[PDB]
Design an enzyme around this catalytic site. Sequence first.
Site, short mmCIF file in Angstrom:
data_model
loop_
_atom_site.label_atom_id
_atom_site.label_comp_id
_atom_site.label_asym_id
_atom_site.label_seq_id
_atom_site.Cartn_x
_atom_site.Cartn_y
_atom_site.Cartn_z
N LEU A 159 0.70 -1.18 -0.19
CA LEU A 159 0.09 0.06 -0.09
C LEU A 159 0.94 1.35 -0.12
O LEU A 159 0.19 2.36 -0.43
CB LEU A 159 -0.83 0.10 1.23
CG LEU A 159 -1.74 -1.00 1.49
CD1 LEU A 159 -2.34 -0.88 2.83
CD2 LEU A 159 -2.89 -1.23 0.33
N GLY A 164 7.66 4.10 2.93
CA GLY A 164 8.45 5.16 3.68
C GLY A 164 9.93 4.99 3.77
O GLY A 164 10.60 4.28 3.09
N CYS A 165 10.35 5.97 4.43
CA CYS A 165 11.86 6.28 4.55
C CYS A 165 12.32 4.74 5.19
O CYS A 165 13.43 4.19 4.48
CB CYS A 165 12.25 7.10 5.35
SG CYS A 165 11.44 8.71 5.56
N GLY A 193 10.75 1.66 5.44
CA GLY A 193 10.05 0.30 5.26
C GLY A 193 8.99 0.35 4.43
O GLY A 193 8.72 1.48 3.83
N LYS A 242 3.04 -3.61 8.68
CA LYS A 242 4.39 -2.76 8.49
C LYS A 242 5.65 -3.60 8.32
O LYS A 242 5.80 -4.06 9.30
CB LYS A 242 4.53 -1.49 9.24
CG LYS A 242 3.60 -0.11 8.85
CD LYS A 242 2.98 0.74 9.98
CE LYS A 242 1.83 1.53 9.28
NZ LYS A 242 1.26 2.39 10.14
N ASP A 276 5.03 11.93 16.61
CA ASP A 276 4.96 12.25 15.05
C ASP A 276 3.77 12.35 14.71
O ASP A 276 3.30 11.81 13.68
CB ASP A 276 5.88 11.40 14.38
CG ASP A 276 6.40 11.72 13.09
OD1 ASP A 276 5.93 13.09 12.42
OD2 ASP A 276 6.50 10.73 12.11
C1 LIG Z 1 10.38 9.25 6.70
C2 LIG Z 1 9.42 8.42 6.91
O1 LIG Z 1 8.51 7.67 6.21
N1 LIG Z 1 9.12 7.77 8.65
C3 LIG Z 1 9.79 8.58 9.29
C4 LIG Z 1 10.03 10.00 9.50
C5 LIG Z 1 9.08 9.61 10.49
C6 LIG Z 1 8.12 7.05 8.61
C7 LIG Z 1 8.52 5.57 8.10
O2 LIG Z 1 9.77 5.27 7.81
N2 LIG Z 1 7.58 4.48 8.04
C8 LIG Z 1 8.01 3.12 7.63
C9 LIG Z 1 7.89 3.20 6.22
C10 LIG Z 1 6.45 2.52 5.84
C11 LIG Z 1 5.96 2.09 7.30
C12 LIG Z 1 6.87 1.96 8.14
C13 LIG Z 1 7.56 6.82 10.11
C14 LIG Z 1 5.97 7.15 10.41
C15 LIG Z 1 5.72 7.17 11.83
C16 LIG Z 1 6.60 6.62 12.96
F1 LIG Z 1 6.49 6.47 13.93
C17 LIG Z 1 8.01 6.08 12.35
C18 LIG Z 1 8.51 6.07 10.93
#
Ligand SMILES: CC(=O)N(C1CC1)[C@@H](C(=O)NC1CCCC1)c1ccc(F)cc1
Length: 451
Positions: free
Chosen positions: A191, A194-195, A197, A213, A304
Site C-alpha cells: 500500500l 516510507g523512509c 520500510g 508494516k 510524530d
Molecule cells: C521518512 C518516513 O517515512 N518515516 C519517518 C520520518 C518518520 C516513516 C517511516 O519510515 N515509516 C515506515 C515506512 C512505511 C511504514 C513504516 C515513519 C512514520 C511514523 C513513525 F512512528 C515511524 C516512521
Amino acid sequence: VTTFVALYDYESRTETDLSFKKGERLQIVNNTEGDWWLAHSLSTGQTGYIPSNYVAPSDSIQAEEWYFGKITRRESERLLLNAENPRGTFLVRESETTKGAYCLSVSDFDNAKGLNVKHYKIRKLDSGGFYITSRTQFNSLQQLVAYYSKHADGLCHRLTTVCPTSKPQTQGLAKDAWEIPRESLRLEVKLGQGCFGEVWMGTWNGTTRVAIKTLKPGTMSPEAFLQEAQVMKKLRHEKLVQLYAVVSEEPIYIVTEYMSKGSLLDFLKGETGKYLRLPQLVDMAAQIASGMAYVERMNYVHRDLRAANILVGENLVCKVADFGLARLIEDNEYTARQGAKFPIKWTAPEAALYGRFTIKSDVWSFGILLTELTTKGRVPYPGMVNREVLDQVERGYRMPCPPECPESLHDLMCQCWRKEPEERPTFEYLQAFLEDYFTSTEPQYQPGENL
Ligand SMILES: CC(=O)N(C1CC1)[C@@H](C(=O)NC1CCCC1)c1ccc(F)cc1
C-alpha cells in the site's frame, strides 16, 4: 451460565477459539471478564474462545440489532448520516446526558438542514416500560421500536432501516496471540513506502485482514521495539489504530488494524477531500483530538502527529497511527531531529532544539495538523524550506490563518503554537472545543412533550 447470542459472524482462525455465525447460541460463564471468553455452542456443539464484543445475553436489549449501546451522540450521527442510508435509518443508544435513559436516533431529511439526525430521549417508566411521548407507552424497548416502525406518530419519520455497521475489530488476533511467526502472515497488497520500510495489506492465519508494516533491518533494535511494544499494546481506544501483533526478528513486522481509506494526508488530497466541508473536517479533527486525549490520559507521547500518520476508515472515521514508534528509530540524523526524513515543520521548538518530546509538543504538532486539515493537505510553511523553519519558528514566526480556515480555528492553532509548552492547551481541551465547535439554539433532543 447464561445463554449468549452471536451478534456477528466470526471465522475461527486458531485451534482454541470457536468459529460461529451470527445468531448462534453460546454457553458462557457468570462473571467472566476480559476480551476472550470460553464458550460452548449449542448450535454447533463446538468449543473455544470467543471475542467478548461479538456476543450479548439472549433476550436482552443488547442482542437487538438496532441497539448500539454506549455509542456517542456524535458517532451515532457519523453512522446514520451515511448517504446510502434511507430516511428513517435508526439506532437506539444510551443517553450521554441523562442517567439510564436511552435515545432513539433517526436519519431524516429537511428542506432547511438537508440530511440530518433527530434524537429522541426514551425514558423509562416506573413499570419498567419506556416512552418517547407520555401519551404512547410501551412495556419494552422492542415494543417501542416495533410501533414506530409502523407509524411515525409524532416522530420525524417512521423507522425504516437498522443502522448498518461493520463487524467490530476483536481485541487481539486471538487469546494469547502477540509475538507471532512470520508464517502466519500473508502480505497481499503493498500500500505504501516510507523512509524505513513499507506498508502492506495482508491476512493473518488465513482469516483476518490486517495491515502489516515491514521495517528495514537496522531501523530499530528488535529488543527495544519489543519492550516498547509491550507498552503500546496497552493503549486501547476507538480512535487509536490497534496494535495487534509483532514479528520480532529481523526484519521486524508490525501487525495493525487495517484502515480501508488509507492515510488522512492522501485522503485530503485528491478525489474525495476536494469536497469535504468544514463541519466534516472539524469532526475529523475532533476524532483525532479524542484519540490524543486518551494518549494524554495514559501519560504517553506520540512524537510524530501529522496527517500522514492519521488513517481513515469508512464514514470519515479517523484514527491515530504509529504512536510512540518514532522514539525507537535508530538513525543518527533523525534522532538528532535533523535530515531530510525529520518532520521539522510539525515539531515544537523545544522538541527540535532539546529533544524534549512530550504531550505538549504533540499539541504543537496537532496545531500544524489542523493546518493540513483546512488546506486539503498542503505542506505547512508553504514557501519555506525545511532548513529555515526552526530559526523562523524560534524567532516567533507562525503560519497565518490559511484561506478558508475560520479565524477561531486559527486562534486554536496559535494556542497549540505557544512558545511555552505549559501554556498550550490539553488534548482534553482540544477535543471538547472541536466537538462543540458548531452550536444551535435549543434543539438537542426533540421535545417529546407531545408529538
Ligand atoms: C521518512 C518516513 O517515512 N518515516 C519517518 C520520518 C518518520 C516513516 C517511516 O519510515 N515509516 C515506515 C515506512 C512505511 C511504514 C513504516 C515513519 C512514520 C511514523 C513513525 F512512528 C515511524 C516512521
